[PDB]
Design an enzyme around this catalytic site. Structure first.
Site, PDB file in Angstrom:
ATOM      1  N   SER A 280       3.004  -0.700   4.032  1.00 11.92           N
ATOM      2  CA  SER A 280       3.137   0.217   2.956  1.00 11.92           C
ATOM      3  C   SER A 280       4.492   0.197   2.310  1.00 11.92           C
ATOM      4  O   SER A 280       5.315   0.385   3.233  1.00 11.92           O
ATOM      5  CB  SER A 280       2.455   1.626   3.206  1.00 11.92           C
ATOM      6  OG  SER A 280       2.298   2.170   2.124  1.00 11.92           O
TER       7      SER A 280
ATOM      8  N   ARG B 138       2.176   8.989  16.323  1.00 20.81           N
ATOM      9  CA  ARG B 138       1.185   9.638  15.464  1.00 20.81           C
ATOM     10  C   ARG B 138       0.208  10.443  16.140  1.00 20.81           C
ATOM     11  O   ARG B 138      -0.468   9.822  16.945  1.00 20.81           O
ATOM     12  CB  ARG B 138       0.850   8.885  14.342  1.00 20.81           C
ATOM     13  CG  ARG B 138       1.905   8.115  13.596  1.00 20.81           C
ATOM     14  CD  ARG B 138       1.440   7.628  12.310  1.00 20.81           C
ATOM     15  NE  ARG B 138       2.671   6.673  11.749  1.00 20.81           N
ATOM     16  CZ  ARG B 138       2.796   6.170  10.505  1.00 20.81           C
ATOM     17  NH1 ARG B 138       1.586   6.143   9.703  1.00 20.81           N
ATOM     18  NH2 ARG B 138       3.931   5.820  10.081  1.00 20.81           N
TER      19      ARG B 138
ATOM     20  N   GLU C 141      -5.364  -2.527   5.795  1.00 27.43           N
ATOM     21  CA  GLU C 141      -3.501  -2.413   5.545  1.00 27.43           C
ATOM     22  C   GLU C 141      -2.721  -2.722   6.757  1.00 27.43           C
ATOM     23  O   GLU C 141      -3.206  -2.566   7.986  1.00 27.43           O
ATOM     24  CB  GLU C 141      -3.603  -1.164   5.588  1.00 27.43           C
ATOM     25  CG  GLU C 141      -2.289  -0.421   4.942  1.00 27.43           C
ATOM     26  CD  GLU C 141      -2.113   0.984   4.929  1.00 27.43           C
ATOM     27  OE1 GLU C 141      -3.226   1.718   4.716  1.00 27.43           O
ATOM     28  OE2 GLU C 141      -1.045   1.469   5.081  1.00 27.43           O
TER      29      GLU C 141
ATOM     30  N   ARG D 268      -6.107   2.344  15.098  1.00 27.03           N
ATOM     31  CA  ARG D 268      -5.485   3.501  14.715  1.00 27.03           C
ATOM     32  C   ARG D 268      -4.762   4.236  16.116  1.00 27.03           C
ATOM     33  O   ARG D 268      -5.268   5.257  16.520  1.00 27.03           O
ATOM     34  CB  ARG D 268      -5.956   4.707  13.980  1.00 27.03           C
ATOM     35  CG  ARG D 268      -5.351   4.806  12.598  1.00 27.03           C
TER      36      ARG D 268
ATOM     37  N   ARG E 270      -0.906  -4.640  14.014  1.00 23.44           N
ATOM     38  CA  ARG E 270      -1.886  -5.031  13.105  1.00 23.44           C
ATOM     39  C   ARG E 270      -1.618  -6.621  12.720  1.00 23.44           C
ATOM     40  O   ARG E 270      -2.601  -7.239  12.590  1.00 23.44           O
ATOM     41  CB  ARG E 270      -1.925  -4.132  11.824  1.00 23.44           C
ATOM     42  CG  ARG E 270      -2.220  -2.592  11.792  1.00 23.44           C
ATOM     43  CD  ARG E 270      -3.404  -2.142  11.156  1.00 23.44           C
ATOM     44  NE  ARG E 270      -3.681  -1.005  11.515  1.00 23.44           N
ATOM     45  CZ  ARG E 270      -4.070  -0.022  10.707  1.00 23.44           C
ATOM     46  NH1 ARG E 270      -4.176  -0.510   9.343  1.00 23.44           N
ATOM     47  NH2 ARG E 270      -4.207   1.166  10.971  1.00 23.44           N
TER      48      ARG E 270
END
Ligand SMILES: Nc1nc(-c2cccnc2)nc2c1ncn2[C@@H]1O[C@H](COS(=O)(=O)NC(=O)[C@@H](N)CO)[C@@H](O)[C@H]1O
Ligand SMILES: Nc1nc(-c2cccnc2)nc2c1ncn2[C@@H]1O[C@H](COS(=O)(=O)NC(=O)[C@@H](N)CO)[C@@H](O)[C@H]1O
Ligand SMILES: Nc1nc(-c2cccnc2)nc2c1ncn2[C@@H]1O[C@H](COS(=O)(=O)NC(=O)[C@@H](N)CO)[C@@H](O)[C@H]1O
Ligand SMILES: Nc1nc(-c2cccnc2)nc2c1ncn2[C@@H]1O[C@H](COS(=O)(=O)NC(=O)[C@@H](N)CO)[C@@H](O)[C@H]1O
Ligand SMILES: [Cl-]
Ligand SMILES: [Cl-]
Ligand SMILES: [Cl-]
Ligand SMILES: [Cl-]
Lengths: 424, 424
Positions: free
Chosen positions: B353, B268, B350, B278, B390
């Protein structure tokens, strides 16, 4: 890079050794630039001597109250001449460096002189190829029989020279990489590493992919928000990030050897090449060693041994090949290639390359060691333990049964929920 | 893409639903183009009727021996007018399609209306955060204490938003991904897949990264020897290759659901964002489901359950959040986010998802199913089970001891040679 001192002091012997690997060292071009460098070095020194003198004279004038304006024009004209000279000198030192970076490594004396793959010498072999009591099916056949290799799905998703692996085949591919990492980290003293798959220009110059092999790589376009610092390339081998972890460091000799392992995907443009044999993406468990200069040849043996143990434990017959001067990679001074038996091809195919890179990358990275005294360059080595897709091919073909099922090698069954065979 | 029939027949309700997620549907622009499309469709038909008639008249002339030259000029002028009209019509059908592709999915009716992250509703929670009997250290602290996280090494190798993991930390990260894949393939009915990490433009249009989110991606420059077919992007999530495996297919409804899992790195650009929270590169074990339209809402529950089981088995407290209309991804019609407890942040972050994408990607890929009769679009779903980095953060922080050691969760010890703790 080669030692600048050998290129300046023994060019004819350097050229002689480089010719053995098919490289023609342009001694005359190099010598002309080297010579103009010394001339410029002196020219700047003379211009500085003259400027300091005229500037010390300008001081005698300011002290004596004399016309200190003509000497001011003289000093500024000298200051300009100095700047032009330092500019010509820097441009020249850059041209020499650019040339130095295109030169491959000098090969070890025990490396046989040869032109290509046909001149590589077999130094040893292990195991005996299986005597099949049926018609041998290839890995594409075996993959498709088990709905585990899907080349058409990969072309749809991306393009040619990519593969999609599913079910027990994908599980086996996964098991192979877990077994390799566990072997090297639990038994061979390698530390595990999770590294970036994108690397920078400095890293690529460090291990030698740059400046000569940009075309062998996938390059990413820079990011809008990282405009001038995101000129990245996809790693062609874990050797690239791993070897660069010591870039610009001074290691205590007691902390050597540094043994690193990593499991990564590898990305190659595959330019000049016209199933799972030569893909754009492939996984490899890599071994990297940072050692003292006195230990690299021992380390090459040790590392090849570590790669060989993977093949032995999987019961895969292979042979050990010493590359000739003309078949080595750019950075290698000595290479052993392990070639595994491929039943469907009735021959041995490359599964690993283990090289002693000498101080070639250490010179580019400025990776040194101290005793605990003065410093010197470390040596670097890298070898596949092993290229995972090639191992999967070897396992599928060597362990195939008459009914099309694939026997799971004993060492992989714990990594495959105790599964004895692929298929029903 | 949304059903073209809803956009043509119920635009005001489509706009009403799209406004809930903050998208203003330009009903007036769309209606103008749609209207000009019907006018052109008729214009071509009339021009073809006139050409066929004048060409049938040119036949009566050739039969009657009359001057068949003025009608020849008439027929060719009509043939030109037809071509210009078909050209205007194609350009128009392209403009409508381009617009259709910028429209996000219509959200499910049970999705709460909201503007951002603050309007997401907690629907459930599991486990109780650990009561620490000492000062909680963060994952960067814990990583560095154990010489397992090296951010400075990654900047040297590549740049910012990249990490190098070493030793037992790297092993733990590896163990987590093996545990996840084994759980989903051995217990949740997912088939394992090894997919390409580079994908093509069609694939990106298929799952919806294109045309709107090119900027979120790393793009590779085309290869010299694949000049017009190597415009690739690095996968942002395994959802991209996995969901596209059924692109352009007609599946027998009895072969549904198709449940696919894969462990891949994810890339990303992270545009608009200003330790392991991130990164540009991160690993994720992804779950993808291809289902009949009647089963997608059940499948969303099932898949979220599969993601939740990873957290439960690792003894990690978390909460389940239903996203509001304004916090969903482009392609989602309904999303559940799992957020894990992070001791050092005194909050839930988070980790997964899980979305029901409805027929949105199926419409772009033209992925259909037959009964066993006529065909209709399948539904697609995807969810993280889980984002590996994570999970590593959560494990390191939740299992930290007072002495700085990290207790290995029971389920990971078989994947870590039976290791009870990280560090000494
Ligand atoms: N029972 C058998 N059936 C068949 C066979 C049967 C039907 C159609 N085509 C071939 N080939 C066999 C066989 N036993 C040996 N072979 C053939 O032998 C080859 C391997 O030879 S070997 O045993 O490894 N010799 C050293 C294989 O590649 C087959 O072509
Ligand atoms: N493009 C390519 N495709 C495949 C491949 C393998 C399996 C399935 N599909 C494709 N393997 C390659 C490959 N390029 C190299 N390898 C395999 O990788 C091994 C080592 O590669 S090497 O270039 O010879 N050396 C390095 O990269 C050094 N870092 C040491 O590992 C070689 O011995 C091959 O087995
Ligand atoms: N024995 C202990 N020593 C210290 C401590 C010791 C020295 C320096 N700084 C802090 N903090 C403790 C502690 N027992 C609890 N805490 C503190 O309690 C916090 C967690 O509270 S809790 O127990 O989770 N409460 C619900 C931690 O984050 C610490 O700040
Ligand atoms: N840039 C990023 N970095 C990291 C990360 C994680 C650990 C260490 N360093 C970085 N995690 C990300 C991330 N972007 C997303 N994630 C993590 O990935 C999870 C799923 O990503 S998502 O974008 O929300 N959804 C998809 O991609 C779907 N394919 C379903 O998996 C999210 O819930 C995060 O936990
Ligand atoms: Cl560009
Ligand atoms: Cl030196
Ligand atoms: Cl370009
Ligand atoms: Cl339809």
């Amino acid at each position: 890079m080669l030692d600048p001192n050998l290129l300046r002091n023994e060019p004819d012997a350097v050229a002689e050794k480089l010719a053995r690997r098919g490289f023609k060292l342009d001694v005359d071009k190099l010598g002309a630039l080297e010579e103009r460098r010394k001339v410029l070095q002196v020219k700047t020194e003379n211009l500085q001597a003259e400027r300091n003198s005229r500037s010390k004279s300008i001081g005698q004038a300011k002290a004596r109250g004399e016309d200190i304006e003509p000497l001011r024009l003289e000093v500024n004209k000298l200051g300009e001449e100095l700047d032009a000279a330092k500019a010509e000198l820097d441009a020249l030192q850059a041209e020499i460096r650019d040339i130095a970076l295109t030169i491959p490594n000098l090969p070890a004396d025990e490396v046989p002189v040869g032109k290509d793959e046909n001149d590589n010498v077999e130094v040893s072999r292990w195991g005996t190829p299986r005597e099949f009591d049926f018609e041998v099916r290839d890995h594409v056949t075996l993959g498709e029989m088990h709905s585990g290799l899907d080349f058409a799905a990969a072309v749809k998703l991306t393009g040619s020279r990519f593969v999609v692996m599913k079910g027990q085949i994908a599980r086996m591919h996964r098991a192979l990489s877990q077994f390799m990492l566990d072997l090297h980290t639990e038994q061979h003293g390698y530390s595990e590493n999770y590294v970036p798959y994108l690397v920078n220009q400095d890293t690529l110059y460090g291990t030698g992919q740059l400046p000569k092999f940009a075309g062998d790589l996938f390059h990413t376009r820079p990011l809008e928000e990282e405009a001038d610092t995101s000129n990245y390339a996809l790693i062609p081998t874990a050797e690239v990030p791993l070897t660069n972890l010591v870039r610009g460091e001074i290691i205590d000799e007691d902390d050597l050897p540094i043994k690193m392992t990593a499991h990564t995907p590898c990305f190659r443009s595959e330019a000049g090449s016209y199933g799972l044999i030569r893909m754009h993406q492939f996984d490899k468990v890599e071994m990297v060693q940072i050692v003292r200069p006195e230990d690299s040849m021992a380390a090459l043996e040790e590392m090849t041994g570590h790669a060989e143990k993977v093949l032995q434990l999987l019961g895969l017959p292979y042979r050990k090949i010493i590359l000739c001067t003309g078949d080595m990679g750019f950075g290698a001074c000595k290479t052993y290639d392990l070639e595994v038996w491929i039943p469907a091809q009735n021959t041995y195919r490359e599964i690993s390359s283990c090289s002693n890179v000498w101080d070639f990358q250490a010179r580019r990275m400025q990776a040194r060691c101290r005793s605990k005294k003065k410093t010197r360059l470390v040596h670097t080595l890298n070898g596949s333990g092993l290229a995972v897709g090639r191992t999967l091919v070897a396992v599928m073909e060597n362990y195939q049964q008459a009914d099309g099922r694939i026997e799971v090698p004993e060492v992989l069954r714990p990594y495959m929920n105790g599964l004895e065979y692929i298929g029903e």
